Scaffold this active site. Structure first.
Site, PDB file in Angstrom:
ATOM      1  N   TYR A  26       0.826  -1.198   0.000  1.00  0.00           N
ATOM      2  CA  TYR A  26       0.000   0.000   0.000  1.00  0.00           C
ATOM      3  C   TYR A  26       0.862   1.251   0.000  1.00  0.00           C
ATOM      4  O   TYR A  26       1.977   1.261   0.523  1.00  0.00           O
ATOM      5  CB  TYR A  26      -0.930   0.014   1.211  1.00  0.00           C
ATOM      6  CG  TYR A  26      -0.241   0.186   2.548  1.00  0.00           C
ATOM      7  CD1 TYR A  26       0.298  -0.905   3.220  1.00  0.00           C
ATOM      8  CD2 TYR A  26      -0.177   1.431   3.164  1.00  0.00           C
ATOM      9  CE1 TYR A  26       0.915  -0.754   4.440  1.00  0.00           C
ATOM     10  CE2 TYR A  26       0.439   1.591   4.380  1.00  0.00           C
ATOM     11  CZ  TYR A  26       0.982   0.497   5.016  1.00  0.00           C
ATOM     12  OH  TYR A  26       1.596   0.657   6.236  1.00  0.00           O
ATOM     13  N   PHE A  36       1.634  10.303   3.247  1.00  0.00           N
ATOM     14  CA  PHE A  36       1.688  10.107   4.686  1.00  0.00           C
ATOM     15  C   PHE A  36       2.116   8.714   5.092  1.00  0.00           C
ATOM     16  O   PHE A  36       2.463   8.526   6.261  1.00  0.00           O
ATOM     17  CB  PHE A  36       0.340  10.435   5.338  1.00  0.00           C
ATOM     18  CG  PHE A  36      -0.784   9.550   4.904  1.00  0.00           C
ATOM     19  CD1 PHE A  36      -1.509   9.849   3.766  1.00  0.00           C
ATOM     20  CD2 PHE A  36      -1.151   8.449   5.658  1.00  0.00           C
ATOM     21  CE1 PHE A  36      -2.543   9.049   3.365  1.00  0.00           C
ATOM     22  CE2 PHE A  36      -2.188   7.646   5.263  1.00  0.00           C
ATOM     23  CZ  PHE A  36      -2.886   7.947   4.115  1.00  0.00           C
ATOM     24  N   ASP A  37       2.119   7.733   4.193  1.00  0.00           N
ATOM     25  CA  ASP A  37       2.533   6.392   4.564  1.00  0.00           C
ATOM     26  C   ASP A  37       2.946   5.643   3.311  1.00  0.00           C
ATOM     27  O   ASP A  37       2.502   5.960   2.207  1.00  0.00           O
ATOM     28  CB  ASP A  37       1.412   5.641   5.292  1.00  0.00           C
ATOM     29  CG  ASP A  37       1.912   4.423   6.047  1.00  0.00           C
ATOM     30  OD1 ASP A  37       3.117   4.101   5.955  1.00  0.00           O
ATOM     31  OD2 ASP A  37       1.100   3.794   6.759  1.00  0.00           O
ATOM     32  N   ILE A  56      -8.879   0.034   8.242  1.00  0.00           N
ATOM     33  CA  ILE A  56     -10.076   0.862   8.172  1.00  0.00           C
ATOM     34  C   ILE A  56     -11.018   0.306   7.115  1.00  0.00           C
ATOM     35  O   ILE A  56     -10.632  -0.550   6.311  1.00  0.00           O
ATOM     36  CB  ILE A  56      -9.726   2.326   7.870  1.00  0.00           C
ATOM     37  CG1 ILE A  56      -9.058   2.412   6.505  1.00  0.00           C
ATOM     38  CG2 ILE A  56      -8.821   2.879   8.944  1.00  0.00           C
ATOM     39  CD1 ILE A  56      -8.900   3.802   5.999  1.00  0.00           C
ATOM     40  N   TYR A  82     -11.343   8.540   8.941  1.00  0.00           N
ATOM     41  CA  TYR A  82     -11.045   9.237  10.186  1.00  0.00           C
ATOM     42  C   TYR A  82     -11.821  10.536  10.375  1.00  0.00           C
ATOM     43  O   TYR A  82     -11.583  11.213  11.382  1.00  0.00           O
ATOM     44  CB  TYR A  82      -9.540   9.565  10.297  1.00  0.00           C
ATOM     45  CG  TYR A  82      -8.622   8.369  10.419  1.00  0.00           C
ATOM     46  CD1 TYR A  82      -8.500   7.682  11.619  1.00  0.00           C
ATOM     47  CD2 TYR A  82      -7.868   7.940   9.338  1.00  0.00           C
ATOM     48  CE1 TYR A  82      -7.661   6.592  11.733  1.00  0.00           C
ATOM     49  CE2 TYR A  82      -7.025   6.855   9.442  1.00  0.00           C
ATOM     50  CZ  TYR A  82      -6.925   6.185  10.641  1.00  0.00           C
ATOM     51  OH  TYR A  82      -6.088   5.101  10.745  1.00  0.00           O
ATOM     52  N   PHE A  99      -5.155   5.882  -2.046  1.00  0.00           N
ATOM     53  CA  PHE A  99      -4.296   4.730  -1.785  1.00  0.00           C
ATOM     54  C   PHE A  99      -3.907   4.046  -3.084  1.00  0.00           C
ATOM     55  O   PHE A  99      -4.726   3.350  -3.689  1.00  0.00           O
ATOM     56  CB  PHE A  99      -4.984   3.730  -0.867  1.00  0.00           C
ATOM     57  CG  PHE A  99      -5.187   4.229   0.516  1.00  0.00           C
ATOM     58  CD1 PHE A  99      -4.158   4.190   1.435  1.00  0.00           C
ATOM     59  CD2 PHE A  99      -6.408   4.742   0.899  1.00  0.00           C
ATOM     60  CE1 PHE A  99      -4.348   4.651   2.714  1.00  0.00           C
ATOM     61  CE2 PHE A  99      -6.604   5.198   2.175  1.00  0.00           C
ATOM     62  CZ  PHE A  99      -5.574   5.158   3.083  1.00  0.00           C
TER      63      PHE A  99
END
Length: 107
Positions: A26, A36-37, A56, A82, A99
């Site tokens: 991912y 962010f990731d 999630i 979120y 994503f």
């Protein structure tokens, strides 16, 4: 809401089922902002299972609509990730998530 936009190749028949563990590279992205990731850094391709609410919701349902080898592009609405809460320091509240997801699973 989850809106798949697939980079094509795969097989179109091998779908994940209940209690199966899938292997995902991912790569997150905030809308109109930076990353962010990622899991491309750690090279630890995030073996998680289906139906235990560990990820999630918007990330979970989009993996069900993919096949082995496919390379999708999720788009999670704030209500399923979120958006009221906001992850403290990493994801602000009321945020739309993107994503890049490759699914090269096992099992």
């Amino acid at each position: 809401g989850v809106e798949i936009e697939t980079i094509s190749p795969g097989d179109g028949r091998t779908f994940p089922k209940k209690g199966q563990t899938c292997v995902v590279h991912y790569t997150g992205m905030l809308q109109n902002g930076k990353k962010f990731d990622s899991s491309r850094d750690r090279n630890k391709p995030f073996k998680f299972r289906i139906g235990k609410q560990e990820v999630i919701k918007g990330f979970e349902e989009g993996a069900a609509q993919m096949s082995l080898g496919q390379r999708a592009k999720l788009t999670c609405t704030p209500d399923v990730a979120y958006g009221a809460t906001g992850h403290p320091g990493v994801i602000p509240p009321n945020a739309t998530l993107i994503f890049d997801v490759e699914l090269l699973n096992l099992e």
